C-alpha cells in the first residue's frame, strides 16, 4: 500500500482507493 | 498494491480502485 | 501505507483513501 | 538506473 | 538513480 | 539520488 | 489555437 | 489560445 | 489565453 | 524587441542578446 | 525575426543566430 | 524581433543572438 521513488516529473493519482 | 520508480515523465492513474 | 522519496517535481494525490 | 530524461504527459478521464 | 531530468505532467479526472 | 531536476506538475479531480 | 493538447518534447545540441 | 493543455519540455545546449 | 493549463519546463545552456 | 503572452508553462531562454 | 503561437507542446531551439 | 503567444508547454531557447 506504499509508494516509493516518485521523481522525474512523475505524477500519480489513485482516486477512489 | 505498491508502486515504485515512477520517473522519466511517467504518470499513472489508478482511478476507481 | 507510507510514502518515500517524492521528488523531481513529483506529485501524488490518493483521494478517498 | 541512470541518465533518464523525458518530457511531459497528459491523461484525462471523464466520468 | 542519477541524472534524471524531466518536464511537467497533466492529469484530470471528473466524477 | 543525484542530479535530479524537474519541472512542475498539474493534477485536478472533481467529485 | 483551439482544443490543442499535446505532450512533452526533448531536443539536445552538443558542441 | 483556447482549451490549450500540454505537458513539459526539455531542451539542452552544450558549448 | 482561455483555459490554458500546462506543466513545467526544463531548459539548460552550458557555455 | 518585446515579448508578449508567455503563459501555459512557457519559458523563453534568450542569451547573448 | 519574430516567432508567434508556440503552443501544443511545441519547442523552438534556435542556436547561433 | 519580438515573440508572442508562447503557451501550451512551449519553450524557446534562442542562444548566441
Mutate to test the interface with I, among J4, J5, J6, J8 (most CBs of I within 10 A): J8
Nearest CA in chain B to E4: B8
Task: Find out whether C13 and E9 touch, Cβ atoms under 8 Å.
Answer: no
Asked how this structure was determined, the answer is cryo-EM
Q: What is the DSSP letter of H2?
A: B
Separation of alpha carbons H9 and F6, rounded Å: 10
- Chains F, H: CB pairs < 8 Å: 3
Separation of alpha carbons L8 and H2, rounded Å: 10
Closest CA to B3 of A9, F12, E8, A5: A5
3-state secondary structure I1-15: CECCEECCCEEEEEC
Chains with at least 3 CB pairs less than 8 angstroms from chain D: A, B, E, G, H
Burial of G7 (0-12, 13-18, 19+ CB in 10 A): buried
Residues of E near D (Cβ–Cβ under 8 Å) read: 1-15
Report the sign of the C-alpha dihedral through residues J7, J11, J15, K2, in that order: negative
3-state secondary structure C1-17: CCEEEECCCCEECCCCC
Task: Find out whether B9 and L9 touch, Cβ atoms under 8 Å.
Answer: no
Indicate the Cα dihedral angle K11, K12, K16, L1, nearest 10°.
-140
Task: Find out whether I10 and H10 touch, Cβ atoms under 8 Å.
Answer: yes
Nearest CA in chain I to E6: I10
Separation of alpha carbons G13 and K4, rounded Å: 23
Question: What is the separation of C-alpha B12 from the centre of its chain, rounded to a whole number of angstroms?
Answer: 3
E8 φ, ψ (degrees, to nearest 5): -80, -165
What is the least distance, in Å, from the CA of F4 to any CA of chain E?
A: 5
Q: What's the resolution in A?
A: 3.0
What is the least distance, in Å, from the CA of E10 to any CA of chain A?
A: 8
CB-based touch K/A (3+ pairs, under 8 A)? no
Indicate the Cα dihedral angle E1, E4, E7, E8, nearest 10°.
10
Amino acid at each position: 500500500d506504499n509508494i516509493k521513488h516518485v521523481l522525474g516529473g512523475g505524477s500519480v493519482q489513485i482516486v477512489y482507493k
